[PDB]
Amino acid sequence: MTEYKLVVVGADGVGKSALTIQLIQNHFVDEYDRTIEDSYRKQVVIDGETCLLDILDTAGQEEYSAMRDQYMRTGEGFLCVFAINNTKSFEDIHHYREQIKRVKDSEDVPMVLVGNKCDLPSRTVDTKQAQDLARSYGIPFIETSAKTRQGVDDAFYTLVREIRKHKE
């Protein structure tokens, strides 16, 4: 049974926890403590392959965790999430990409740029901005809404496909 070890990163409030729970539990969580970091596991079928997902929902807290360390070290792909109504969160993305490059000592890490909250009308980052940024990195860009499930499987599955390419 293939396992994929994914990590969800991004600024506070972008929806990292909502997207992870929406994937795992198929419901949209209104409020979830911003300082809570946890791992989730679900067996799924991606493209006809049954596999295990093992997902760390980061909170970027400073107290030490040894789980945090192993997933950064052993994690195989990363979701870099910003919100489309949050210009500062899109500006924060570079910091997170550079941190992942450092942990993997590599410019080629499986990674997907996710622009969350696409159910909102007050959009300050347009698709081209985000598409230009993902092309710069050579990684996919996927629009998500944790609230209605739009793109949620696509974001997590596309990353797994990025992991598959790397493993070849």
Ligand SMILES: Nc1nc2c(ncn2[C@@H]2O[C@H](COP(=O)(O)OP(=O)(O)O)[C@@H](O)[C@H]2O)c(=O)[nH]1
């Ligand atoms: N409208 C909308 N709100 C969202 C979406 N995802 C998350 N939120 C809301 O944004 C806030 C932060 O979400 P949370 O999952 O705690 O973000 P985190 O800090 O990245 O873990 C919460 O109030 C969520 O209800 C979304 O797709 N659409």
Ligand SMILES: [Mg+2]
């Ligand atoms: Mg959270």
